Amino acid sequence: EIVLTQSPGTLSLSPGERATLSCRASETVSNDKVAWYQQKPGQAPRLLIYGASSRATGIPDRFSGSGSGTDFTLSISGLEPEDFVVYYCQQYASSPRTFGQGTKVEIKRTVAAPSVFIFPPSDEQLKSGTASVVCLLNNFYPREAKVQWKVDNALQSGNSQESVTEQDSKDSTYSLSSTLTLSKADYEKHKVYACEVTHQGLSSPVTKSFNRGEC
Amino acid sequence: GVAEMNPNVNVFVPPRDGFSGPAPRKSKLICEATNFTPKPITVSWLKDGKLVESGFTTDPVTIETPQTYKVISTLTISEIDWLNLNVYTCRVDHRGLTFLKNVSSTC
Amino acid sequence: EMNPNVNVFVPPRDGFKSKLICEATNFTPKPITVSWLKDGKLVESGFTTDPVTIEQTYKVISTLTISEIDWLNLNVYTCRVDHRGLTFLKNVSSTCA
Amino acid sequence: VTLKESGPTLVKPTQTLTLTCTFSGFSLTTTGEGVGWIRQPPGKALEFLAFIYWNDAKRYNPSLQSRLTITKDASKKQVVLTLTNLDPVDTATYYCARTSGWDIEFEYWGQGTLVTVSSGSASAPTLFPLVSCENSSPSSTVAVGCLAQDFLPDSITFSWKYKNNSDISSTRGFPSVLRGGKYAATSQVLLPSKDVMQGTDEHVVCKVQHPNGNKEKDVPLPVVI
Numbered sequence: 001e002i003v004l005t006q007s008p009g010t011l012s013l014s015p016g017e018r019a020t021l022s023c024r025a026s027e028t029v030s031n032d033k034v035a036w037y038q039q040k041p042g043q044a045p046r047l048l049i050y051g052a053s054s055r056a057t058g059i060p061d062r063f064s065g066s067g068s069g070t071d072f073t074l075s076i077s078g079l080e081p082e083d084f085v086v087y088y089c090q091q092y093a094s095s096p097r098t099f100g101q102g103t104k105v106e107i108k109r110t111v112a113a114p115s116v117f118i119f120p121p122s123d124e125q126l127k128s129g130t131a132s133v134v135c136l137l138n139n140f141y142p143r144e145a146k147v148q149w150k151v152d153n154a155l156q157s158g159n160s161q162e163s164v165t166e167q168d169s170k171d172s173t174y175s176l177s178s179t180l181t182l183s184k185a186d187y188e189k190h191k192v193y194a195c196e197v198t199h200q201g202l203s204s205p206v207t208k209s210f211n212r213g214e215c
Numbered sequence: 216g217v218a219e220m221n222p223n224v225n226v227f228v229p230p231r232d233g234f235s236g237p238a239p240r241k242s243k244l245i246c247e248a249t250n251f252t253p254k255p256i257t258v259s260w261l262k263d264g265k266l267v268e269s270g271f272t273t274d275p276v277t278i279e280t281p282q283t284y285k286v287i288s289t290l291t292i293s294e295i296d297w298l299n300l301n302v303y304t305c306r307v308d309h310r311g312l313t314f315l316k317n318v319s320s321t322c
Numbered sequence: 323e324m325n326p327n328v329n330v331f332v333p334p335r336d337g338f339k340s341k342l343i344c345e346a347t348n349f350t351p352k353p354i355t356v357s358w359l360k361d362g363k364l365v366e367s368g369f370t371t372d373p374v375t376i377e378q379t380y381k382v383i384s385t386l387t388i389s390e391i392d393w394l395n396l397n398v399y400t401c402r403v404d405h406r407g408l409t410f411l412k413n414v415s416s417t418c419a
Numbered sequence: 420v421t422l423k424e425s426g427p428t429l430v431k432p433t434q435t436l437t438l439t440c441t442f443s444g445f446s447l448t449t450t451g452e453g454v455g456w457i458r459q460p461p462g463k464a465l466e467f468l469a470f471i472y473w474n475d476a477k478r479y480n481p482s483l484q485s486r487l488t489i490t491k492d493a494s495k496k497q498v499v500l501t502l503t504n505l506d507p508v509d510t511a512t513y514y515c516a517r518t519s520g521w522d523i524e525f526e527y528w529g530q531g532t533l534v535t536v537s538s539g540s541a542s543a544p545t546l547f548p549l550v551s552c553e554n555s556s557p558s559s560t561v562a563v564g565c566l567a568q569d570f571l572p573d574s575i576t577f578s579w580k581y582k583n584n585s586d587i588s589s590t591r592g593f594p595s596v597l598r599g600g601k602y603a604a605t606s607q608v609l610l611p612s613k614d615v616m617q618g619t620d621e622h623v624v625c626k627v628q629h630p631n632g633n634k635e636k637d638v639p640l641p642v643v644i
C-alpha cells in the first residue's frame with residue numbers, strides 16, 4: 001500500500017510561466033516506475049510520460065520529468081491555456097497500483113467582487129412540502145470563499161451541500177451555488193432568511209435578506 | 216428583479232400677464248404626472264385636434280413604500296394662438312390607458 | 323452675466339390643490355437662489371427647490387404648495403430671484419378671479 | 420487502438436453490476452500487455468479496482484479484495500467485470516485502458532460510461548419557478564434562474580428563450596449534487612437591465628431536454644423599469 005499525496009491542491013499560474021508539480025510517495029518505488037497522467041473534465045485521461053523520464057508518442061517535448069526515490073517533480077515549459085487541467089502521478093511498481101489525489105492548476109487573475117442573489121421558494125414548491133432557498137455567487141476570485149447561512153440569528157450547519165462551477169473559458173472567473181433545505185413546517189416558523197458571503201476583495205461582509213410574505 | 220397606480224394629469228398655463236419678449240410674445244405649457252407607476256409614460260400635445268411634433272421638450276423621468284416617479288414636459292406656445300380660444304390637451308399613455316386633460320382661457 | 327427671466331405659472335381657468343412653478347432660464351453662473359412670497363410675507367414652509375439642470379445655460383425650477391381656496395381669494399404671490407446682487411419680483415394673479 | 424465501454428445506466432443498490440470493455444485491434448498474447456479498470460467519483464481522484472495480466476494472471480486490491488471478479492474471453496476479445504454489493508457512495512465512471520509493455524502503462528484510454536447507483540427510479544425532472552426578491556440595490560444587472568429538481572440520471576441541457584422565441588447565451592451551468600438519493604441542480608441566466616425595461620414581455624420560458632419528459636415551465640418576470 002503506497003500512499004500518494006500531491007500538494008498544493010490548487011495553484012494559480014500565468015500563461016508562459018513555469019509550473020512545478022510535486023508528487024509525494026509513502027515509500028521508495030522500485031526501479032523508479034512512476035508515471036504521470038493528464039485528465040480533462042468531460043474527456044478521458046491521456047498518458048503523457050511513462051517511467052518519469054520517457055515521453056510517449058504524440059506528447060510535446062515541453063514536458064520534462066526529473067527526480068527519483070521518493071521525490072518527483074514535473075516541469076512544464078511554455079504553459080498553455082489548454083494545459084490548465086488536473087494532473088495525477090501514479091506508480092506501476094506496486095501491483096496492485098495506487099493513484100494520487102491530483103493537483104489542479106488555474107489561471108491567475110485579479111480579484112473581482114462577487115454578486116449575491118437570494119431567491120425565496122416559490123408558492124408551488126411549498127405545496128410539495130419542501131422549501132429550497134438558494135444563494136448564488138458569481139464573478140469572484142479566488143475560488144476559495146466562505147458561504148454561511150444565518151436564519152433568525154441562528155447559524156445553520158450540517159445542511160448545506162454546496163455546488164461550484166468550473167473556471168470560465170472566456171472570463172476566468174468562478175461561480176458557486178448554495179441551497180438551503182428545510183421542512184415546510186420549519187419554514188413557517190422562521191421569518192428572515194439570509195446567507196452571508198465573505199470575500200477577500202470586500203472591506204466588509206455583505207448580507208442580503210427578505211421578509212416572508214412580501215415575495 | 217408592490218403596487219400600481221393610475222397616473223395623474225396636471226396642466227399648467229401662463230397667466231394673463233405671463234407673455235413677454237418681442238412681438239409676437241411666446242410662453243410655455245407644463246404637463247406633469249406625479250405618483251405614477253410603472254415608470255414608462257408617453258407625453259404628447261394636442262392643439263385643436265392636431266398633434267404637435269415640434270417646439271416641445273420633455274425632461275427625463277426622475278424619482279420623486281410604493282416607488283414613485285415624476286415627469287416634466289414643456290411646450291412652447293404663441294400668444295396669438297392662445298387668444299384664439301385654442302384648446303390644449305396633454306396626452307398621457309400608461310400601460311395601454313389614455314388620460315386626457317383639456318384646458319382653455321375661458322372662465 | 324445675463325439677468326434671469328422670471329415666469330410664474332398659474333392653474334387652469336376651468337379648475338385643476340395645485341402647485342406654483344417659477345422658472346429662471348438663461349442665467350450665469352449656475353448658482354442661484356429662488357424664494358417665494360405670500361401677500362408680502364416671507365414663506366417659511368411648503369416650498370421646495372429642484373436641483374439645477376443644464377439646458378452654456380442653466381435651468382432652475384421651484385415648487386410651492388398652495389390651496390385651492392387661497393389661490394382664488396386674490397392672494398398676492400411673488401417669486402423672488404437673486405442673481406449677481408440683483409433682485410427680481412414678479413406679481414401674478416388669477417385672470418378669472 | 421481504441422476502447423469502448425458499455426453497460427446499464429441505472430442499477431439498484433445491493434445487486435450485481437456487469438460492465439464490458441470492447442476493444443479491437445490487438446490480442447492479449449504478448450507479455451506485459453494487460454487490462455485494468457479505473458473509476459473516479461465526481462469531485463474525487465482516480466481509484467484503482469483491479470488489473471489482469473496475460474496467462475490468466477489477475478491482481479486485486481486488498482481494500483476491495485473478495486469483492487470483485489475478473490474474467491476474460493479471447494473469443495469475443497472483451498474483458499467482463501462483475502461488481503457486487505453496490506453502494507451509493509461507490510458511484511463513479513469506469514474506464515478501461517491497454518498497457519503496451521512493462522513501462523508504457525495505460526497508453527490508450529476509451530470513453531467510459533456513467534453508472535449511477537441510486538435506490539430511486541428514473542423519474543421525470545421537476546421544474547420550480549424562481550422569483551428574485553432583491554430590493555434597494557438594482558446594481559448593474561439582475562439574475563433569474565430555473566430549479567430543475569428530481570432528475571436521474573444527470574444529463575440536462577439548459578436553453579433560455581424570450582416570449583417571442585428568441586435566443587439567449589447564458590452558459591451558466593451548475594453541476595448536480597446527490598441529495599437524499601436524487602440529483603439536484605440549478606441553472607441561471609444573466610440579462611441586461613435595459614432590455615427588461617422595454618418590451619411588454621413579462622415572462623420567459625425555461626427549457627430542459629431530459630430523456631424522461633419534455634416539460635417546460637415559465638418564470639414570470641416582476642419587471643422593475
Ligand SMILES: *[C@@H]1O[C@H](CO)[C@@H](O[C@@H]2O[C@H](CO)[C@@H](O)[C@H](O)[C@H]2NC(C)=O)[C@H](O)[C@H]1NC(C)=O
Nearest residue numbers: 581582583584585613614615616617618619620
Ligand atoms: C423579442 O422581444 C425582445 C424584447 O425584449 C426583443 O429585444 C429587443 O430588440 C433588439 C433587437 O433584436 C434587441 O437587441 C434588444 O435586446 C431589445 N431592444 C431594446 C431596445 O432593448 C427581441 O429582438 C425580440 N426578438 C426578435 C426575434 O425580434
